Paper text:
It invades different cell types using an actomyosin motor that is connected to extracellular adhesins via the bridging protein fructose-1,6-­bisphosphate aldolase. Aldolase is a glycolytic enzyme; however, it is recruited to the invasion machinery to serve in a structural capacity. Previous work has identified that the C-terminal cytoplasmic tails of key parasite adhesins bind to the aldolase enzyme active site and actin binds at another interface. These two interactions connect the intracellular motor to the extracellular adhesins.
Here, T. gondii fructose-1,6-bisphosphate aldolase has been crystallized in space group P22121, with the biologically relevant tetramer in the asymmetric unit, and the structure has been determined via molecular replacement to a resolution of 2.0 Å. As we did not cleave the purification tag, we expected a full-length structure containing 355 amino acids; however, the first 14 amino acids, which include the purification tag and a portion of the 3C protease cleavage site, were unresolved in the structure. While the four chains are identical in sequence, barring missing amino-terminal residues, there are structural and quality differences amongst the chains. Furthermore, alignment of chains B and C with chain A using the MUSTANG server gave a Cα root-mean-squared deviation (r.m.s.d.) of 0.41 and 0.28 Å over 340 residues, respectively, while chain D deviates by 1.63 Å over 333 residues. Three helices in chain D are tilted with respect to those in chain A: α-helix 2, α-helix 11 and α-helix 12 are tilted by 12.8, 8.91 and 3.97°, respectively. When we look at the orientation of the arginine residues in the TgAldolase structure, we find that the corresponding Arg58 and Arg319 are shifted or in alternate conformations. Arg58 resides in α-helix 2 of TgAldolase and we find that this helix is shifted away from the binding site compared with the position in the PfAldolase structures. Arg319 belongs to α-helix 11, which also deviates from the PfAldolase helix 11 position; however, this arginine is in an alternate conformation and completely blocks the adhesin-binding site where the key tryptophan docks. In order for adhesins to bind to TgAldolase, this arginine would need to rotate out by 90° to allow the tryptophan to insert between Arg319 and Arg58.
Author numbering:
A (entry chain A): 15 to 355
B (entry chain D): 17 to 66, 73 to 355
C (entry chain C), D (entry chain B): 16 to 355
The structure:
């Protein structure tokens, strides 16, 4: 009587998933969000007088990924599907640039949000249909991790998040994570609890701990390998309309505590969203968290698109401005990494 | 209290009434809209190749014996050679259109090939479109296996099928479609009828708890399970009376009587075996829900056998189609 | 190939089913005669009677020896003392009940205790030694059990909380399985209090959630629904609701919540009636029965106030015995026929 | 904001965390001296000593009066009598313990009972009266509790079934919450027996399912993990397994199963061991500690065999006190050093 090999992730894949997961959530570093859609790229390119063409998107993302030494501060890069199959102007596959900097490619694989019937606009995350085939293709193209956004909200008067909300989120997250790992992708698990409301931080801690207990029990039920998975929740914070906002030390305290109360330490890392300005509250919050411990999980940042805002402004679509632009990107990347510690 | 917490009185009434009509006394559901390939096996006994849908739909009086018809999506938008939409022909007969909306099966990772049913993505939009085109019920098939040595059906299997069914059902009702819930427990294996009874009760308990959690209106839903039987390689086959007994017991043990009907899958049985089993079930006193057995395949079969591929036999082909529809229908009374 | 020890035996299943069917008779009801020494002290004081064991025996003899009472009473709840007690003329109480075909039963829980770190939400205690108690009670002639679980409705405080529901359903399932392991019919009692100003739609919602969880739990614990009974509260508005539901509304919602959650294998559903034929509960169950035939039998578990006028008529003095019994006989009668 | 009644207070949380941290000391272990009157009657009969309260008191006093014992002992399990016992010089046993910094605790469950219609799978009884017992125990000086749950592994029979796991988790979480509501640290004890021929991978799989369920339930019942301790079996092959695991494998899978399921807020995990320094468990725990620093402390809860040599050195002779204590001391020392 033994466990069948078909019931476990193989040695090869478990080692790959663990190694990649560990590299992606590096404390010195962060994930570059370079996955704007055509529609979002239009707004950005417009701000600098650049025409939104496929070729120019290739110029822009070559500008990002070919920045010499970026991998010292950037652990991974989120790509739009177009970019995953795209070559630079000089003929170099985007994934090859990333590889040259040791930056790990990833991609969003969900199909967005849909209201759960008979809830007060509480949301399910869709995308399981054809997800395995997508993950296979993506891995073959060079992606090594996935994203999948789930959303919960807090509203005590309306009983949010309802049981159904939490059940759905946990199930979707677990299915998506197992499917990812079946296709050799590290899943980034993302139960995002919105800050909408005037609840204070203790409420957010309570909700967070309940949601995370549920999510990890679900991950265990679906045979998800925590050693090859990552967690990206919101930090534990007061609601945006709370009249008594938490301090950075408090946010650090409650976030570390919720994680330690619910996250098994087999999970190698927990990441949080930062808007990529080194002085912003998310930086301060994470720095305060790192002052504590050290922890059973690596802490790291997933950077919003604004990280490369100045890079864009420096470049302006002008070839001659590449070096300058890339210099700027480095200094932002470095400074955000350093701000964590 | 509150507004968007409940199904409206209007919609709940429509769903309840349509579920009632679908699971009507003395009637069955016609399953004769079939694909290109699957009618090669069907044709090659009658030996014609390539109107048929017209032959099925233009059969006057069929509503007496047929409560619903299963259509493909394309058929919903299709018109008669006289410009009449197929769904308007079905409507004139009082026959309710329905459609299978799941996207088939996919292995649950790290299980021994137990299956998730796929198809929630875009499902709500599809359902809205189908209602607009005239569909009033939907069908979703989940599959589970029995294998005591391998712990099948596993907790993950049961959990996934219950989740997918409840999700599907809630979405259907959100788009004014009656959901037909089909948790199919395969008869593979050597287990006897007591094992199937035990598993069926566990599965249906999980499924109806999930349906409650997802706010599914039972009054506007329908259940389509296998009858409870011995496994196909079982050395001690169950009698008709035993099948009746354990099937009725499993249902009474797990299914709230707000559900208007239970319409059994053919499950690999003969038409007359299924008829006999249902008869033994009817012997077992009045039930809180309508019980039906499936026979669309047999109807389509004998109609095709009458047709033989010649345009001359149309009338005859329709007459027998009515006759058999009657015989099967009245067998359920 | 399922195995013997995984299911209630045929004989015991038959016994449980038959006793359950008998307990939930439509024209009849359960007599609540299980006053504690203290309660019975109170309303013995109400008629100037010294609360002694002998006088309690007099009183319950007077109840259970009413000739014909079995036409309107299907079961009787006893205090433990009474289960082992003889009438003053030497007849075992259970023998008196058996002569009238009245089935004896008894409460087996040990009351309520707050769930830690909840807002005063309650677990029902009583599982320790419960099996042994049921065995002995059966041995003494008991054939059904009672176990009160409590939940509250409070939207502002998220009540009933998931932990409340989970605890109640676990404890109920546990209790019921043990009962049946000792050949007792368990009366499953998830009582949802009427505290609050919520209207009837809120109570219907909560009742349906709670009952769904309860019956899933009963299934998880291998409980035989065929040999069990349910006694919930009727679905109603809150005691402080400004817009109260009507009798017809109450019937509609109660029947609907049951049909939406209770599997038909369950042979009966009982409700609390205060023992008067004209009160709200009677009219409610009446509207319920007017609403066509049901998968479950509907019945009444009468409160200790039913035999009150019998006690007033008795006044402890022996000469009134017959008289007292007459009163009882009519009372039950009036309460029986009113259900249908 | 969150209600203060929804959380363990700062003072109590701090007390629980500190006591838990002290109990799960890596260089130490828990002394088990909670024999009942019968058990101690057997152990005394082994060395020709009359089993009286006087002699029991002498024995307990000899154990707990060992000066310096607090170096290798962080806790002591007492039988209820011992908690209220005094030395011949009138010093409370718990005060002797306090002087050595050794923390007292007590087993509070009421043993196992078969879950109905299971193949003799066991529920743990003891929740009735548990809160009151815990309050009294704390008042007498108790600071931790023990509660043993038992599961088995049998693939052909589908053990541990869902009901077994569900029950174990429910009982453990209720008990944990009640302890913490009375300021006791609960040691949570989901014991998975080694009966069977399965190999270590099966045990690991089962352990991970069981622990996942236990910890979800601990969360559902608002159990403060910072003030709790876990005491599972090590992950090993079954006792009849033909292909036994190595010490390194046992360490690997045990550590893995814990890291896969146990949140790092839990200060420590303790395993069961005999009083033998070079026994399997000691080498296993040793192999575990070598696997770098862990998110929780690893420790030992010793069996009643630890003091067997002390008990034998005593010989019931008062003059033999001083030496016997040395025998315990040494016997403790090795056991502490064989862990790290």
């Amino acid at each position: 009587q033994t466990q069948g090999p078909g019931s476990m992730i193989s040695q090869e894949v478990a080692k790959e998933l663990a190694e990649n997961a560990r590299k992606i959530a590096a404390p010195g570093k962060g994930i570059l969000a370079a996955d704007e859609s055509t529609g979002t790229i239009k707004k950005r390119f417009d701000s600098i007088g650049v025409e939104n063409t496929e070729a120019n998107r290739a110029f822009y993302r070559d500008l990002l990924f070919s920045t010499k030494g970026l991998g010292q501060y950037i652990s991974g890069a989120i790509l739009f599907e177009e970019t995953l199959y795209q070559k630079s102007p000089s003929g170099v596959p985007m994934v090859d640039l990333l590889k040259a900097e040791g930056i790990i490619p990833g991609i969003k694989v969900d199909k967005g949000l849909e209201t759960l019937p008979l809830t007060d606009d509480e949301k399910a995350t869709m995308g399981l249909d054809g997800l395995s085939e997508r993950c296979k293709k993506y891995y073959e193209a060079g992606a090594r991790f996935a994203k999948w956004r789930a959303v919960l909200s807090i509203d005590p008067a309306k009983g949010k998040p309802t049981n159904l909300s939490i059940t759905e989120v946990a199930h979707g997250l677990a299915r998506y994570a197992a499917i990812c790992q079946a296709n050799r992708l590290v899943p980034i698990v993302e139960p995002e609890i919105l800050t909408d409301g005037s609840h204070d931080i203790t409420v957010c801690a309570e909700v967070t701990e309940r949601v995370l207990a549920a999510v990890f029990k679900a991950l265990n039920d679906h045979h998800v390998l925590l050693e090859g998975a990552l967690l990206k929740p919101n930090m534990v914070t007061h609601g945006s309309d709370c009249p008594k906002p938490a301090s950075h030390e408090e946010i650090a305290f409650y976030t570390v505590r919720s994680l330690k109360r619910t996250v098994p330490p087999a999970l190698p890392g927990v990441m949080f969203l930062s808007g990529g300005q080194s002085e912003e509250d998310a930086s301060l919050n994470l720095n305060e968290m790192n002052k504590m411990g050290p922890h059973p999980f690596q802490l790291s940042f997933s950077y919003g698109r604004a990280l490369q805002a100045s890079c864009l402004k420096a470049w302006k679509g002008v070839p001659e401005n590449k070096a300058k632009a890339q210099q700027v990107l480095m200094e932002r990347a470095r400074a955000n990494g350093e701000a964590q510690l």
